[PDB]
Design a protein around this ligand. Structure first.
Ligand SMILES: Nc1ncnc2c1ncn2[C@@H]1O[C@H](COP(=O)(O)OP(=O)(O)O)[C@@H](O)[C@H]1O
Ligand SMILES: [Cl-]
Ligand SMILES: [Cl-]
Ligand SMILES: [Mg+2]
Ligand SMILES: [Mg+2]
Ligand SMILES: [Mg+2]
Length: 1282
């Protein structure tokens, strides 16, 4: 009706490398395309007119991104847009910016990509193939006109509820609905529904059946995990779930919550929890217990269909699980896992890989590993949690396993996302839901999502979830006045699961109004509103008298919320519809949550034969090369540098280790607070291919490896370590059900209670198989049983963590071989890379000795007797030693004669254990310590790390294997090289790869022009006079807490200043002498990073004036970091002395870069870098749009001549660099900070505030104390103010 759509043209959309890729793709499909050009195009659906000033504002909002060369359009237009009926996340954010800039006339903004294709005459046939290359069929459509985008904004009238005519047709009505709605109901569930509605005397509504079906799936009831079993004809006494709970019955130690919430909780440490007070707005430390929550989800089916959103919402859903623990809690750090079939990277096929086909309807393993990590990282980056540990396994082979010869793999992948958080002691327990409590949906509007498998295409808006987390944080930060009585995440089933679960958990019923739920799709039916799986939502209960407070909190964060119902004493569920004046749902809860009896699974053991490894084509040298090329083993950088590892300022140990930043850390460690050396650790263990031979061994190894990956961290009591067990299986596949029972028993009833390990959380995914028609033949690809164990623990001292970085001081390398010389080769990387399974796999060989291992390591860690540790896992001792030599950038000389005559088995078995490095003078003491724990016969002196490039393995006087360590390290890098090369700018991928081949690279290294231990602010702090700093944040910012903390340590009173506070008058910048614009992803970077934030200031004349006035005062200081640097660069019209500043645009890599980068401080006016000029030291970088862009060389030369460049990326050799990733973003002349003429304003891309604490620097010199060099910036600001 009365809307009108405006078209606004945008910038050129693809860089020269992406255009070439497209042209090459067209060439290789024999489509004669001579040229292709693309522009972004924007569509504004308007509800009232724009005046000229508004219109110019909207046009300006929509000019963003890198200044790529524009061209006059020519050839055939193909416009790609989101498909009609969908709203992109880009839309949600861009429209929020328009609204925050005072353009309420904009109902919605949407974007497309206009492609202009010049081709020979192409059949309509071939035009469709061109169009297919240019869009994602699961999310987008192609139009032939710009005006066709009107279809994206059509207003549809609400669809009414539909009843299913049980009373008029009998059981057939329920049968028909089952089919037509895809309810997947069993016979006995159809019976139950028939009887329930017969008793009620009325026809069920569609919404009620849908809801019921969502509540009664195998999964939502966990029928398998609660089933009775009979195994080989004997009834078993416990369900799988009871056997897991056995670990809690045996070891309840330190557990605060298990099996009754959205996450498990264990005891943490008493530390200073740092946040801004509700009454003052000032950041302060609050000394109190910070207890530790933990959870791990999977998202396997959606990732097979659309991997980017599948992975993104796997992380997003898990983050809501965390925030909705107890009465509200705070995510801290994440972990990520993938298992896929063989990559078969074009031009880099490996000799074990065979193409077995796949279903047409799923994506490939390569597409999952291309798009899926980017999705997981998009959510973690934009929400703001660091991703600090993970796994990635490839497996796809035709093997003689439990059910004979068949294809085993991961066409349906594992996509795993988990994390830890912190929680207050008084919020661990869910509160009572008082009768009459208000029932609220916190979060995003509902769309028709989760209802070609379009129903499995998810959608992520992380910035929305950050806004909600800020509200959750405000609530828990009120302590006793936290108004959240009860909270739950919204996930599977949408509100139709979440609301009834919330009321039911509190022993209440609810009454709801459909029309009070926020919706962005007015066409939706009641079923679609109630049951859709739209993201970034939470449900909670609050007392009516707390609404004004909750409203204030949400409005300050710009977090949408709706009060949608009231908790009732009666245990009934009612949903009313004010629009249709009727009652879509009217049910007793016991009807809905009544569910018929348990399952019995009556099953049989199948055990694989086992075939000795045929070693005809195997040599040691060839094996080394192959194994280094297995993705499971190979360097993981493509999965690591795409995800932030520094947000919060609490990351102590990330994946990257040492001066050469080699991703081999065995576990993650965070600090518990910004004022403590207590912390938390996370590790993973998994060994699925072993399950093709021995189900229970595979489970024991997952537990064992979690422990060996965590063991060189200072924990103490093994009972401190708590596990998530995520069970992936093809239930019903022959042999798999008995295997599953045996595996759960092996860990739940046996190994975990014996070791003293609790499993207080877990999940299950029980249809891990794919079937399709290939020739005329039915084909199937079935996963091994795949247990993933994640281990979580309180850490006693983060400073004492060891890594695989070898020292070349005089040393001894000692193998701890928990295999006890079994040296198994079955189901190893070695076997896999020669297309075999082998005979007998590794296993836990001696439970006492595994515990003894852990205890001995804990003793050695606490006594500081270890130089390094690296455990043995995929690729064996060979890979353990190789990875240590890579991390230490050195050689090894080791002898293996004591490990058996079979050198292949000694080097490549994947038995538990690993290598410790000790000082030579400590070898005897360490061996005696290990002997005290019962390990003497498992312990073997191997030799030593030596300076240089030789990787040497001997056995008596024979050389078993010898090769350049650089050669091995480059082979090991080739997979990440190839993935980066196909996914990112290939020039950057090549530069990064090639740098690894230069052994003379000295690694990160420091030069200091000042005393980093000299607190120049101390005389000021000692007065007790603390100037304020405005810690400025906009919606989506994430790095404000640690920014506050850095200024706090330098003597400031850090004030939380939201952009909403400046709009509402609750703060005025006239009361401040210092302001800092913080990092993150304001508005998700939509409309260009920092742009929405800056233009919200520029387009509100009052706030614009406020900023201009602050910056023109003679003594004020300002700092902009990351998103803040971008924001300040985007309103330089307000900042004196800033006329030569550049813009900050998409990195040359075309990828987010989370790096620990070397920079030098350069001479400039900057008052914040006084005393530091000439210093060189690393700094945290975490950005996608950090590349300095200038208008032309005139501009660059002027900026440089003016002397305003304050930081530059250098290589490890100390030279100013544009080579990647030493310069991570492509900025000319390495530029990454600039200042104004007077030196009072400085802006920079890297994050000094994330690394002001030495313990939070991924690598640093051993002689540093608590302060890193970057503390000096904050101290300089304090001293300058005087
Ligand atoms: N999917 C992933 N996402 C992020 N980090 C990962 C991922 N997979 C592996 N990593 C990290 O890369 C490094 C090497 O991984 P891997 O060799 O699987 O570990 P390990 O063999 O010690 O179990 C580790 O620091 C690990 O946390
Ligand atoms: Cl499925
Ligand atoms: Cl070092
Ligand atoms: Mg490994
Ligand atoms: Mg390891
Ligand atoms: Mg592992």
């Amino acid at each position: 009706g009365s809307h009108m759509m405006e078209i606004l043209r945008g910038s050129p959309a693809l860089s020269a490398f992406r255009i070439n890729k497209l042209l090459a793709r067209f060439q290789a499909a024999n489509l004669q395309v001579h040229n292709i050009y693309a522009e972004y195009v924007h569509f504004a659906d308007l509800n009232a007119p724009l005046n000229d000033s508004e219109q110019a504002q909207l046009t300006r909002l929509l000019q963003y991104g890198p200044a790529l060369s524009s061209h006059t359009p020519a050839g055939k237009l193909l416009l790609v847009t989101p498909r009609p009926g969908t709203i992109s996340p880009w839309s949600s954010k861009a429209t929020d910016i328009a609204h925050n800039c005072g353009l309420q006339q904009v109902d919605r903004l949407e974007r497309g990509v206009a492609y202009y294709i010049e081709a020979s005459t192409l059949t309509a046939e071939q035009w469709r193939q061109v169009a297919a290359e240019l869009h994602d069929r699961m999310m987008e459509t192609v139009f032939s006109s710009l005006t066709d985008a009107e279809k994206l904004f059509i207003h549809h009238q609400p669809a009414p509820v539909s009843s299913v005519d049980l009373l008029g047709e009998g059981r057939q009505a329920l049968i028909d609905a089952n089919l037509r709605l895809g309810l997947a109901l069993a016979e006995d569930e159809i019976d139950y529904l028939q009887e329930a509605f017969t008793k009620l005397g009325r026809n069920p509504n569609d919404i009620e059946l849908y809801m019921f079906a969502q509540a009664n799936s195998e999964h939502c009831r966990h029928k398998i995990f609660n089933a009775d079993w009979i195994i080989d004809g004997k009834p078993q006494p416990k369900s799988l779930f009871k056997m897991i709970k056995n670990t809690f019955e045996t070891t309840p130690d330190y557990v605060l919550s298990a099996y009754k919430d959205n996450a498990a909780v264990m005891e943490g440490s008493a530390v200073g929890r740092y946040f801004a007070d509700h009454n003052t707005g000032r950041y302060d430390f609050h000394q109190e217990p910070a207890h530790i929550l933990m959870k791990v989800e999977t998202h396997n089916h959606p990732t097979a269909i659309s991997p980017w959103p599948g992975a993104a919402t796997g992380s997003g859903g898990e983050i809501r699980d965390e925030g909705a623990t107890g009465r509200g809690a705070k995510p801290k750090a994440g972990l990520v896992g993938f298992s896929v079939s063989n990559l078969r990277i074009p031009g880099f096929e490996q000799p074990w890989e065979e193409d077995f086909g796949k279903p047409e309807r799923i994506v490939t393993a390569l597409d999952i590993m291309t798009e899926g990590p980017l999705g997981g990282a998009a959510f973690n980056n934009e929400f703001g949690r660091p991703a600090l540990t993970g796994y990635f396994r490839t497996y796809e082979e035709k093997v003689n396993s439990h059910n004979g010869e068949e294809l085993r793999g991961y066409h349906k992948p594992i996509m795993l996302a988990g994390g830890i958080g912190n929680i207050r002691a008084d919020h661990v327990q869910k509160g009572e839901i008082v009768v009459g409590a208000k029932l609220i949906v916190l979060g995003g509007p509902a769309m028709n999502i989760g209802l070609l498998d379009f129903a499995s295409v998810q959608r992520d808006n992380p910035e929305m979830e950050r806004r909600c987390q800020e509200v959750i944080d405000r609530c828990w930060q009120l302590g006793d006045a936290n108004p959240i009585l009860f909270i739950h995440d919204v996930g599977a089933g949408g509100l139709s699961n979440a609301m009834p679960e919330l009321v039911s958990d509190g022993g209440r019923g609810g009454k709801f109004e459909l029309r009070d739920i926020l919706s962005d799709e007015p066409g939706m039916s009641p079923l679609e509103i109630w049951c859709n799986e739209s993201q970034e939502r939470y449900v909670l209960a609050v007392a009516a008298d707390q609404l004004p407070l909750f409203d204030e909190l949400c409005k300050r964060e710009r977090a949408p919320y709706a009060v949608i119902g009231d908790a009732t004493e009666e245990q009934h569920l009612s949903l009313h519809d004010n629009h249709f004046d009727n009652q879509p749902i009217d049910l007793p809860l016991d009807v809905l949550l009544g569910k018929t009896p348990k399952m019995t699974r009556d099953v049989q053991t199948l055990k694989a034969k086992g075939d000795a490894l045929n070693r005809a084509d195997i040599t040691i040298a060839d094996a080394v090369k192959r194994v280094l090329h297995l993705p499971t083993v190979a360097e993981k950088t493509f999965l690591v540098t795409i995800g932030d590892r520094t947000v919060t300022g609490m990351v102590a140990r990330d994946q990257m280790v040492g001066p050469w930043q080699v991703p081999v850390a065995d576990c993650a460690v965070t600090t518990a607070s910004l004022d403590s050396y207590y912390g938390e650790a996370m590790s993973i263990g998994e060994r699925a291919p072993v399950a093709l031979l021995d189900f229970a061994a595979s489970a024991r190894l997952a537990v064992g490896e979690a422990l060996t990956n965590i063991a060189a961290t200072q924990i103490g009591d093994i009972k401190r370590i708590k596990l998530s067990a995520n069970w992936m299986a093809a239930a019903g596949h022959p042999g798999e059900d008995a295997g599953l029972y045996d595996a759960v028993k092996a860990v739940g009833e046996e190994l975990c209670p014996q070791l003293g390990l609790t499993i207080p959380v877990g999940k299950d995914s029980m249809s891990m198989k794919t079937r399709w028609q290939e020739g005329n033949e039915q084909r199937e690809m079935t996963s091994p049983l795949s247990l993933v164990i994640s281990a979580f623990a309180r850490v006693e001292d983060v400073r004492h963590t060891l890594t695989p970085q070898l020292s070349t001081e005089d040393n001894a390398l000692l193998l701890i071989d928990l295999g006890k010389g079994h040296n198994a080769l079955g189901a190893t990387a070695l076997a896999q890379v020669y297309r075999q399974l082998g005979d007998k796999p590794a296993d836990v060989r001696d439970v006492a000795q595994l515990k003894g291992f852990y205890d001995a390591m804990q003793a050695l860690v606490a006594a500081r007797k270890l130089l390094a540790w690296h455990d043995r896992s995929d690729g064996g001792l060979l890979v353990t030693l190789a990875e240590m030599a890579f991390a230490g950038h050195c050689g090894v000389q080791v002898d293996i004669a004591a490990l058996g005559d079979d050198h292949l088995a000694a080097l490549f078995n994947e038995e538990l254990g690993g290598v410790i490095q000790v000082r030579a003078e400590d070898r005897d003491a360490v061996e005696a310590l290990l002997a005290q724990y019962g390990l003497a016969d498992c312990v073997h002196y191997l030799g030593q790390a030596l300076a240089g490039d030789r990787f040497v393995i001997t056995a008596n006087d024979q050389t078993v294997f010898s090769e350049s360590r650089t050669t091995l390290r480059v082979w090991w890098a080739e997979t990440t090289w190839q993935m980066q090369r196909l996914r990112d700018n290939p020039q950057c991928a090549d530069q990064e790869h090639e740098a690894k081949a230069n052994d003379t690279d000295p690694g990160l290294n420091v030069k200091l022009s000042f005393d980093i231990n000299e607190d120049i602010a101390a005389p000021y702090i000692a007065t007790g006079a603390r100037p304020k700093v405005a810690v400025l944040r906009e919606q989506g910012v994430n790095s404000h807490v640690e920014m506050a903390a850095a200024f706090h340590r330098a003597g400031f009173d850090a004030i939380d200043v939201h952009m909403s506070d400046l709009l509402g008058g609750r703060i005025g910048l006239g009361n401040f002498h210092a302001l800092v614009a913080c990092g993150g992803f304001s508005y998700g970077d939509v409309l260009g990073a920092g742009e929405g934030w800056a233009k919200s200031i520029l387009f509100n004349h009052r706030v614009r004036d406020e900023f201009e006035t602050f910056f023109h005062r003679p003594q004020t200081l300002a700092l902009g970091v990351c998103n803040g640097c971008q924001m300040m660069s985007n309103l330089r019209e307000l900042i004196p002395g800033s006329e030569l500043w550049p813009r900050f645009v998409r990195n040359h890599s075309d990828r987010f870069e989370a790096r620990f980068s070397l920079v030098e401080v350069t001479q400039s006016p900057s008052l914040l870098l006084q005393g530091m000029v000439g210093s060189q030291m690393p700094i945290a970088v975490s950005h996608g749009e950090g590349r300095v862009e200038v208008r032309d060389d005139a501009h660059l030369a002027a900026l440089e001549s003016k002397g305003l460049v304050a930081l530059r990326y250098v290589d490890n050799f100390g030279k100013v660099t544009e080579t990647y990733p030493a310069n991570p973003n492509g900025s000319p002349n390495g530029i990454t900070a600039v200042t104004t003429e007077n030196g009072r304003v400085t802006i920079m891309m890297p994050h000094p505030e994330r690394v002001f604490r030495t313990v939070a620097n991924s690598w640093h010199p051993e002689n540093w104390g608590e302060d890193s060099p970057w503390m000096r910036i904050f101290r300089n600001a304090r001293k300058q103010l005087g």
